[PDB]
Design an enzyme around this catalytic site. Structure first.
Site, PDB file in Angstrom:
ATOM      1  N   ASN A   8       0.382  -1.153   0.053  1.00 13.37           N
ATOM      2  CA  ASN A   8      -0.235   0.256   0.138  1.00 13.37           C
ATOM      3  C   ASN A   8       1.133   1.592  -0.103  1.00 13.37           C
ATOM      4  OD1 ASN A   8      -1.935   2.290   0.579  1.00 13.37           O
ATOM      5  ND2 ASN A   8      -2.276   1.728   2.370  1.00 13.37           N
ATOM      6  N   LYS A  10      -0.131   4.220  -0.289  1.00 17.52           N
ATOM      7  CA  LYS A  10      -0.866   5.054   0.313  1.00 17.52           C
ATOM      8  C   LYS A  10      -0.949   6.284  -0.092  1.00 17.52           C
ATOM      9  CE  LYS A  10      -0.210   3.203   5.393  1.00 17.52           C
ATOM     10  NZ  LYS A  10       0.201   4.217   6.539  1.00 17.52           N
ATOM     11  N   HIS A  93      -9.462   1.194   5.620  1.00 12.11           N
ATOM     12  CA  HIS A  93      -8.238   1.353   6.052  1.00 12.11           C
ATOM     13  C   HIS A  93      -8.518   2.798   7.272  1.00 12.11           C
ATOM     14  CE1 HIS A  93      -4.128   2.634   6.457  1.00 12.11           C
ATOM     15  NE2 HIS A  93      -3.889   1.518   5.763  1.00 12.11           N
ATOM     16  N   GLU A  95      -6.866   4.872   7.909  1.00 13.33           N
ATOM     17  CA  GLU A  95      -6.748   6.557   7.498  1.00 13.33           C
ATOM     18  C   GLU A  95      -7.928   6.686   6.921  1.00 13.33           C
ATOM     19  OE1 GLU A  95      -3.096   5.450   5.897  1.00 13.33           O
ATOM     20  OE2 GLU A  95      -1.885   5.120   6.593  1.00 13.33           O
ATOM     21  N   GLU A 165      -5.261  -4.509  11.615  1.00 12.65           N
ATOM     22  CA  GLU A 165      -4.655  -3.244  12.127  1.00 12.65           C
ATOM     23  C   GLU A 165      -4.781  -2.593  13.258  1.00 12.65           C
ATOM     24  OE1 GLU A 165      -4.706  -0.601   8.907  1.00 12.65           O
ATOM     25  OE2 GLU A 165      -6.886  -0.337   9.004  1.00 12.65           O
ATOM     26  N   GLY A 171       1.162   5.918  15.768  1.00 14.80           N
ATOM     27  CA  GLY A 171       1.210   7.156  16.948  1.00 14.80           C
ATOM     28  C   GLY A 171       0.297   7.209  18.135  1.00 14.80           C
ATOM     29  N   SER A 211       3.337  -2.136  11.931  1.00 15.86           N
ATOM     30  CA  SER A 211       4.703  -1.801  10.770  1.00 15.86           C
ATOM     31  C   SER A 211       5.316  -3.222  10.224  1.00 15.86           C
ATOM     32  CB  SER A 211       5.345  -1.440  12.062  1.00 15.86           C
ATOM     33  OG  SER A 211       6.275  -1.231  11.298  1.00 15.86           O
TER      34      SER A 211
END
Ligand code: NA
Ligand code: NA
Ligand code: NA
Ligand code: NA
Lengths: 250, 250
Positions: A8, A10, A93, A95, A165, A171, A211
């Site tokens: 991906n 992104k 996703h 995000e 995910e 973060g 990750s």
């Protein structure tokens, strides 16, 4: 279950020139073992990707809208994607769920429509920091999955890939262990078997979408219920082939 | 002020083949008068549009994200767009404000970033059914404009086009008159002159973004403060050239 690695990109790279340079690199990579490789790139680079990318790999959208066409300024649709020969889209996703505020109902209709229209989907799910800390990750992930299930038409589970995910690990200051990935992938599989049956559960690729890097892809691949990866920043790097090639450890 | 016609295909057409067929038609159209023509198309068709579209016309994105690149799955960015030679983007279209829930702060940052990065923008605004009925359209539109103003860097107003959308007249059962369009375009201009000065106000193209068709483009063009159109469904039709050519009546 064939090992599955989605790359991906992104919202990267910045230029069509970079994307072509990156395709060229990908086109020269020596794949080892047995693995289904899919590459997701921004809408504008999809034509150049569909044309130049090695034909033993597949191209993916990073999102699609719910409708075939219409008064949806700014939106790209499944027919437009398929018109280029593109067979895959990413859905749900983190995000998009967070930044663009995509809710489950939206994502359910997106999956129904994509599948009804011949697409294969990478449907992402995953719990946030608070449910992780509360020990309520299984529950949160089931709710996401239970929302996804009725979207899947009969005969279509062969075209569904699910990506976990660990959003609680993005973060937040917290990191996920290899054990965590295996555990949540097992949670999803068990959820599938309970709700739609063992045969489905035993065939659905479930991917780890945390990750993934050259330094961890092998241990992660070895987990029994991890069937592959939805790769982030390493999609843009030469280490992506290490990750594709981690399949030999699964 | 040069008359300005933007053709917004929105989420159309369905296929790259249709888009090419449509470009071919556009490429044969005899433009009369003096008019700046811009065509907005979905992200995937932008490369094919940039390459094939008549070079006296310009290509537009229908949206862009706030950042140059990054962890923004599904999003397309200004650098990607510019990498193809594309100089325009649409921002703040009602459909994005409503369906994709884009708020003013989001759109302000999008304008700042685009302009700082060499883009020209078509920034849309417009009030809904309730403020229209309350006689509070001017106020609602000023609030939108006052949010937009600080985004515009010095020397950049030459790269700003503002489009008024009578959203109260979209899927509500109500229709807008030619007088309405002139009136709201005048409202925006007066708002500009009051806040950022007469010279700016006198140069900024303000467009009517309601329903524009061959049967109304001429009367609409004649209004003193209407500088052109952001065209919807007629972008996809042969009547688009009638609309481009309505400039002779302004
Ligand atoms: Na099938
Ligand atoms: Na494995
Ligand atoms: Na300037
Ligand atoms: Na006019």
């Amino acid at each position: 279950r064939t090992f599955f690695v989605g790359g991906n990109w992104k919202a990267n790279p910045k230029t069509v020139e970079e994307a072509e340079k990156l395709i060229e690199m990908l086109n020269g990579a020596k794949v080892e073992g047995n693995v289904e490789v899919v590459v997701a790139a921004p809408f504008g680079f999809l034509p150049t990707l569909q044309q130049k990318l090695r034909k033993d790999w597949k191209v993916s959208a990073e999102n699609v809208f719910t409708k075939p066409n219409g008064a949806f300024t700014g939106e790209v649709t499944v027919p437009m994607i398929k018109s280029f020969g593109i067979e895959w889209t990413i859905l749900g996703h983190s995000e998009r769920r967070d930044i663009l505020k995509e809710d489950d109902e939206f994502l359910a209709a997106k999956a129904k429509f994509a599948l009804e229209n011949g697409m294969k989907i990478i449907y992402c799910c995953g719990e946030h920091l608070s449910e992780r800390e509360a020990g309520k990750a299984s529950e949160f992930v089931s709710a996401q999955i239970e929302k996804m299930i009725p979207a899947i038409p009969a005969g279509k589970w062969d075209d569904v890939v699910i990506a976990y995910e660990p959003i609680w690990a993005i973060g937040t200051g917290k990191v996920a262990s290899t054990q965590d990935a295996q555990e949540m992938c097992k949670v999803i599989r068990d959820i599938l078997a309970a709700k739609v049956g063992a045969d489905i559960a035993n065939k659905v690729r479930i991917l780890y979408g945390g990750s993934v890097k050259p330094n961890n892809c092998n241990e992660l691949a070895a987990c029994p219920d991890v069937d592959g990866f939805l790769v982030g920043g390493a999609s843009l790097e030469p280490g992506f082939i290490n990750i594709v090639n981690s399949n030999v450890h699964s």
